[PDB]
Enzyme design. Structure first.
Site, PDB file in Angstrom:
ATOM      1  N   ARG A  12       1.583 -10.005 -10.570  1.00 43.10           N
ATOM      2  CA  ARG A  12       0.208  -9.708 -10.183  1.00 43.10           C
ATOM      3  C   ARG A  12       0.151  -8.906  -8.889  1.00 43.10           C
ATOM      4  O   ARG A  12      -0.854  -8.241  -8.609  1.00 43.10           O
ATOM      5  CB  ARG A  12      -0.587 -11.007 -10.068  1.00 43.10           C
ATOM      6  CG  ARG A  12      -0.814 -11.669 -11.418  1.00 43.10           C
ATOM      7  CD  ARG A  12      -0.791 -13.184 -11.327  1.00 43.10           C
ATOM      8  NE  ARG A  12      -1.889 -13.710 -10.526  1.00 43.10           N
ATOM      9  CZ  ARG A  12      -3.160 -13.704 -10.901  1.00 43.10           C
ATOM     10  NH1 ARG A  12      -3.533 -13.218 -12.074  1.00 43.10           N
ATOM     11  NH2 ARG A  12      -4.080 -14.208 -10.086  1.00 43.10           N
ATOM     12  N   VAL A  13       1.212  -8.958  -8.082  1.00 42.44           N
ATOM     13  CA  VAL A  13       1.312  -8.049  -6.943  1.00 42.44           C
ATOM     14  C   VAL A  13       1.468  -6.614  -7.430  1.00 42.44           C
ATOM     15  O   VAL A  13       0.813  -5.692  -6.928  1.00 42.44           O
ATOM     16  CB  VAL A  13       2.471  -8.466  -6.021  1.00 42.44           C
ATOM     17  CG1 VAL A  13       2.556  -7.535  -4.830  1.00 42.44           C
ATOM     18  CG2 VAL A  13       2.264  -9.889  -5.553  1.00 42.44           C
TER      19      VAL A  13
END
Ligand SMILES: Nc1ncnc2c1ncn2[C@@H]1O[C@H](COP(=O)(O)OP(=O)(O)OP(=O)(O)O)[C@@H](O)[C@H]1O
Ligand SMILES: [Mg+2]
Lengths: 466, 44, 518, 466
Positions: C377-378
């Site tokens: 998700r980064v």
């Protein structure tokens, strides 16, 4: 008051009190931590002679049995008022941001309120105009009604949240509350802080127009259980002033999971698939204060994580029992740069009926879905043999469907600085007229482009002329 | 004709997958309920 | 100057001790179970103290225990050592400290217990600071967005599933799939990236932890690695407190930093080798304490258990030091049951997942990542600008191949564009295949992926693609050492394929392809 | 040191001892019976005031609530030494074979021992030389490692065990231990005793080189629980001498099951599907004594029975958490007269990496099992195409696959007196060289059935020349 800790088993503790002055249920007993800081435990059960079983809501690792306990005589006192705006709080109401304490002058209200009585409820349902074309047409909001959003958070959910906050702020009274239930400290707290402080509207940042309450992951199950009630308590002050509030609850399933964990810790018998026996009652204590009353209205959008992929699982089932509209953000719609990546076929709404939104709104919305559904059926066939085999009219529906799904895009005022494109607020009537005039035949000569990230049909034509 | 037959068979297989997914989820929920019920009974 | 010693002494002797007798409160063991003692009336005990069980007749040592349950008229203390010696009637003393572990520069290259006691047999731990286990997470406003990348060294992770400093990426897989292999490859790749790796080894066999330590020592990675170990034979208390000891040791690095290669390193990487075994240990602890179970017999606060542990892994801002603590939890699912209780808990907690599947592992794709379901998700924020610019086409082509993955064996009887997409996907998948203990630096991965995304491996047959890479980098390692440095120097440039590096890399690839035959 | 029985519920006996002489947590109770022998219990839970709850290890169908019990102070003491070799023992160490009791001069060791410390563990995995081509090539063992066979009856598993014992006893000193945990008394006994007594090597029977401990299904759960530890103690005695030990824990899963029952009768709160809460620790305390230290190595090749076919079940998962290699015996290979029924596929080993075995060993082991990676998937094509008469090059691959499948078979020394064929011991280097040279094509000149039962490629060549 002035009880003593009798038992410490994990987060669940027990406190003995005199035969009189025993705290009620949900009474937020406080344990001094040997310094200014304190541990607030919420009483969940009364046992025998003065013993009360409570949930820690904190570390409860430095405590010893026999330590002093103070009864507050009321549920968790949460500060309410304009002072909460632009500030970030935890479940207990303590501001976790850099700024200092709220101050004793600000009013504090109990966390455990009661939903508005039967008299105060609105007899009729009024449509909440968000301004986003796809949201306001395919799955229209309901004023004072719950709404669910389904996404993997990589499809611009925060963009939609910020757009809703900005729209209500600029075209209504406009105060919003964001309840980060089960919210990650990195992904869900600092990233959203930077996004909301950077996003600006009419010289005011979005963060200045919202009250953010974070029950983080690292907090015990009681904190994640009661953070939603804290957010409702904070929003109810603004609702009581006649204002209209948007409450954004991230992953209400995490609220359900926190309730289940609290019930398991308390020893209560399990129900169905590892769910609390008080699932319906707990979901009714929440999401019932989210109603459109006579004085004001609280409309909530709640992200819902579906365990495995079960829409029949008890947690999503109980959530759905209280939902008025569902918005289904989908990955493929966002891979192509349609940022309002609302899947029209999957997203539905209860208020989309002729008797409320009007016959014209219902008729155009069904036709929009009908041609899109036909396009979805022909998605196989187009990859099967090519667009050539498709019959005429069906070829038009594919051509028209692509244009309309491109037209679902809309520039956002909160994304103006990132994309360099001014936001366009499209009213519901304007959206209905634009899409009806798209369907009837106008704009057919216009290619698929010039519909991308536009406002009304008027914008699509003016652009075509230029 | 083979293309049409395989399209129909793929659609039928997808429908059967949906039905089997519903049945599997029902069985999964029943299994979790049975497990927690017997664990609570053994604890009590 | 012995007089300094005589002066420092003979003063604290005379007036540094109270020597006043006083009543102290102890407890009597009244029931010993399967590693659980009840301790009867030991008051003034903190909710997670480490009781002592002082030595008695027949026992010249002390076994410590954690007072987990502070019941009324009883204190159920989980035993850290061996329970076979503690009997009913034994006296216990309540040491006033919650479990603390030594931290600092001293614990580098040393294998220790979750209590900080060395088990490598190389001498006592040298330290001056003890950090408390079970501390509160750094906080909301204390962190910063993850920007610095953690170079795993595996093309698949480092290109499609970025890991950044402060990001919590979950290594989830089924039994023997390569989770520890991926973690060890990540640890070995931090040789010169200024990071202090930590390996926790919760519930692993002593032989496996020994082989991991041997692999790390053999590659010279045991000069910046801290190895904690609570093996299977050890009591459930040690396995329960192992990850917390590891993350306290890592929080010391994150906040204060250590002198690594004569540089203040404030970045740490911690690998919880099995949270699926830590959860099992905590379940055993809870059930032996007769705490109410939940789903799959796990206690109610087992999500809280891993949540405390993982939420202490943060990327601190410049005000608080600028340190980091990357966490790499490892989970062993059963038959790819992602919807299981602990896997779902940790998946919801973490910021990403690296799904390792047994099907790909057995097929031949030895790094068995499933890119379709593995997420980070980064995302691009955890990649260098070079890798971010080059891996987009890689991800797109791999997704297109996955959409056509059912068609590989029918590639001949297909469209020319579909056959080309399938062939490119096969080449990329063979490129992502990687041997063990051979991490590729960022410049090498960037060069290989630039050669692959651009039409340069099209003429190379699929079974040789791996070999091609293993040769090409060697070529760049010997024939053209300057292009690798040129790529590495401007890897942070916004428009990475700047004309200078573009021409250098093009010329290197053309020169390699001209000489070699495949 | 004498207590009185208080309660008797099945195979769980509660006994009250004097206040200052309570037995330890794993001591033996040793209830004396009227007819001369004794019932040795094992303490499991100290509780109350001098009261200990213990597991029976016996029937307990003739015991009152007042019988005296004599604490032995030490845990179950089992005879260890060269005397306890070639003999059959029960869980208590009492010889159940026809021969006489073990003499008092033989050392008795506690059943419960601490596994070797971390410092003593080998820092590099080492291959264990068995001599079987398919085992030493596809699924190499580990010195001090665990291997599990997944096979039923009639696949030659017993003959494989006998040959492993014979090979370790010939090439190394190689004393062996066999713990039948929860086995059928028909299969485990009088069909292992007779087959190993009949099987002979260097005029010495296999049974003469093997210790046997048998806790069968008829015995109470405690006996099946501690038979594994009895065998571990007997093997650890020889390991302390530096000699290499091969230990076969037949149905290690029946160990886990035993523990489950021991917990259910002990009042322990159930875990997962009825299994004991102390599952991982109980398995670790048995699987961690099986390791390769500096002095010696206890290599183990266990047998695992999965209930139904569920590898997700907690017992098989816990077993697999401690396994280094899997050998999959198959009916199809066994019925094809291939004496070693080890399947080239579905037989894995973590040692099979180029860092330990070597690059050439890994390369050939990947070259083989690749022509069978498809499992000759051509066999499906041959079924509906007849090879399309012939394959362009596949027909070669089929020939090589058939040749190597025949070559995996090996004449066993233990079967030398049954099939009248001398046993062949093949080193791992010989196996790797033979298979590599066969895959190069040197083996494309000999027909099939010339690889049928021969130790090395060179041995196949000698046959072709003659
Ligand atoms: N990247 C790789 N390259 C080559 N071989 C590999 C790789 N990953 C795994 N293997 C092989 O698979 C074996 C098992 O890998 P590993 O021990 O890392 O798995 P795991 O998921 O940690 O398993 P466990 O559950 O047993 O701890 C290794 O010993 C090695 O032989
Ligand atoms: Mg592992």
């Amino acid at each position: 008051a002035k009880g003593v800790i009798q038992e410490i088993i994990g987060v669940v503790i027990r406190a003995k009190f005199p035969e009189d002055e025993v705290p009620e249920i949900y009474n937020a007993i406080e344990i001094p931590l040997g310094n200014g800081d304190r541990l607030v435990c919420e009483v969940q059960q009364q046992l025998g002679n003065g013993v009360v079983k409570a949930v820690a809501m904190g570390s409860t690792d430095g405590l010893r049995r026999g330590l002093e306990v103070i009864d507050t005589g009321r549920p968790i006192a949460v500060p309410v008022g304009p002072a909460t705006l632009g500030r970030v709080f935890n479940v207990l109401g303590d501001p976790i941001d850099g700024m200092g304490p709220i101050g004793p002058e600000v009013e504090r209200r109990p966390i455990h309120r009661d939903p508005p009585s039967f008299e105060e409820q609105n007899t009729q349902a009024q449509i909440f105009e968000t301004g986003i074309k796809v949201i306001d047409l395919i799955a229209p909001f309901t004023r004072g009604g719950k709404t669910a959003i389904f996404g993997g958070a990589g499809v611009g959910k925060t963009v939609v949240i910020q757009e809703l906050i900005a729209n209500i702020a600029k075209e209504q009274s406009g105060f919003s509350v964001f309840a980060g239930v089960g919210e990650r400290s990195r992904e869900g707290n600092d990233l959203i802080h930077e996004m909301k402080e950077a996003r600006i509207d009419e010289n005011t940042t979005v963060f200045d127009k919202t009250v953010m309450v974070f029950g983080q992951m690292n907090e015990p199950p009681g904190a994640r259980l009661r953070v939603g009630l804290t957010a409702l308590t904070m929003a109810e002050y603004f609702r009581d002033e006649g204002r209209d509030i948007l409450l954004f609850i991230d992953n209400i399933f995490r609220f359900v999971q926190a309730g289940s964990e609290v019930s398991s810790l308390l020893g209560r018998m399990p129900s169905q698939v590892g769910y609390q026996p008080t699932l319906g009652t707990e979901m009714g204590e929440l999401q019932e204060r989210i109603t459109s009353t006579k004085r004001g209205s609280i409309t909530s959008m709640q992200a819902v994580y579906v365990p495995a992929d079960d829409y029949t699982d008890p947690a999503p089932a109980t959530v759905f029992s209280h939902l008025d509209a569902t918005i289904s953000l989908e990955r493929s719609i966002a891979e192509r740069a349609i940022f309002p990546a609302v899947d029209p076929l999957a997203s539905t709404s209860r208020i989309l009926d002729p008797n409320i939104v009007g016959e014209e709104h219902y008729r155009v919305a069904q036709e929009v879905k009908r041609v899109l559904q036909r396009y979805k059926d022909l998605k196989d066939i187009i990859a099967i043999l090519g667009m050539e085999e498709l019959s005429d009219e069906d070829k038009l529906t594919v051509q028209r469907a692509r244009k309309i799904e491109l037209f679902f895009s809309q520039p956002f005022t909160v994304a103006q600085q990132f994309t360099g494109r001014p936001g366009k607020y499209v009213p519901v009537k304007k959206t209905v007229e634009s899409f009806a005039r798209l369907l009837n035949g106008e704009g057919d000569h216009i290619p698929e482009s010039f519909f991308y990230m536009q406002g009304d049909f008027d914008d699509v034509l003016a652009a075509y002329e230029a | 004709a083979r293309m049409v037959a395989m399209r129909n068979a793929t659609n039928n297989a997808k429908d059967l997958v949906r039905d089997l997914t519903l049945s599997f989820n029902k069985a999964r929920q029943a299994a979790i309920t049975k497990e927690v019920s017997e664990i609570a009974s053994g604890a009590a | 100057i012995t007089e300094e010693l005589i002066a420092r002494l003979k003063q604290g002797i005379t007036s540094g001790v109270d020597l006043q007798p006083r009543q102290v409160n102890v407890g009597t063991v009244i029931a010993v179970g399967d590693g659980v003692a009840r301790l009867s009336g030991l008051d003034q005990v903190v909710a997670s103290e480490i009781v002592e069980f002082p030595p008695k007749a027949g026992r010249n040592e002390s076994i410590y225990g954690i007072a987990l349950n502070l019941e009324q008229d009883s204190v159920a203390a989980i035993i850290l050592g061996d329970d076979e010696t503690i009997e009913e009637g034994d006296m216990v003393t309540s040491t006033g400290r919650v479990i603390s572990v030594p931290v600092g520069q001293g614990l580098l290259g040393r294998v220790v217990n979750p209590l900080g006691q060395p088990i490598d047999g190389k001498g006592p731990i040298v330290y001056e600071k003890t950090r408390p286990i079970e501390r509160i997470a750094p906080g909301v406003i204390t962190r910063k967005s993850v920007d610095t990348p953690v170079q795993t060294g595996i093309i698949a992770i480092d290109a499609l599933i970025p890991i950044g400093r402060g990001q919590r990426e979950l290594i989830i897989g089924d039994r023997q799939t390569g989770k520890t292999a991926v973690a060890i490859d990540t640890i070995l790749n931090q040789k010169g990236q200024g990071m202090v790796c930590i390996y926790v080894a919760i519930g692993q066999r002593r032989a496996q932890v020994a082989q991991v330590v041997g692999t790390l020592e053999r590659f010279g990675a045991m000069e910046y690695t801290i190895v904690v170990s609570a093996t299977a034979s050890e009591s459930a208390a040690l396995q329960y407190i192992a990850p917390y000891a590891g993350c306290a040791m890592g929080e010391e690095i994150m906040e204060n930093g250590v002198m690594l290669n004569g540089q203040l390193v404030k970045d740490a990487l911690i690998v919880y080798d099995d949270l699926s075994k830590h959860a099992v240990a905590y379940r055993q602890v809870s059930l032996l304490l007769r705490r109410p179970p939940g789903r799959e017999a796990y206690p109610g606060d087992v999500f809280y258990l891993h949540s405390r542990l993982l939420e202490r892994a943060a990327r601190l801002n410049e005000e608080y030091g600028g340190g980091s603590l990357t966490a790499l939890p490892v989970i062993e699912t059963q038959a790819n049951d992602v919807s299981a209780y602990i896997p779902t808990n940790v998946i919801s907690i973490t910021d990403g997942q690296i799904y390792l599947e047994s099907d790909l592992f057995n097929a031949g794709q030895r790094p068995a990542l499933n890119v379709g379901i593995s997420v980070s998700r980064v995302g691009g924020a955890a990649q260098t600008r070079a890798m971010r610019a080059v891996a987009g086409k890689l991800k797109g082509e791999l997704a297109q191949f996955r959409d056509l993955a059912a068609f590989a064996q029918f590639a001949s009887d297909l469209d020319a564009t579909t056959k080309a997409q399938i062939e490119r996907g096969q080449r990329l998948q063979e490129l992502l295949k990687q041997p063990q203990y051979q991490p590729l630096p960022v410049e090498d991965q960037v060069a290989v992926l630039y050669a692959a995304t651009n039409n340069y491996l099209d003429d190379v047959p699929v079974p040789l693609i791996t070999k091609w890479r293993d040769d090409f980098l060697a070529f760049l390692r010997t024939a053209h050492p300057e292009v690798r440095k040129l790529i590495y120097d401007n890897r942070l440039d916004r428009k990475f394929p700047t004309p200078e590096v573009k021409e250098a890399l093009e010329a290197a690839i053309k020169e390699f392809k001209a000489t070699s035959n495949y």
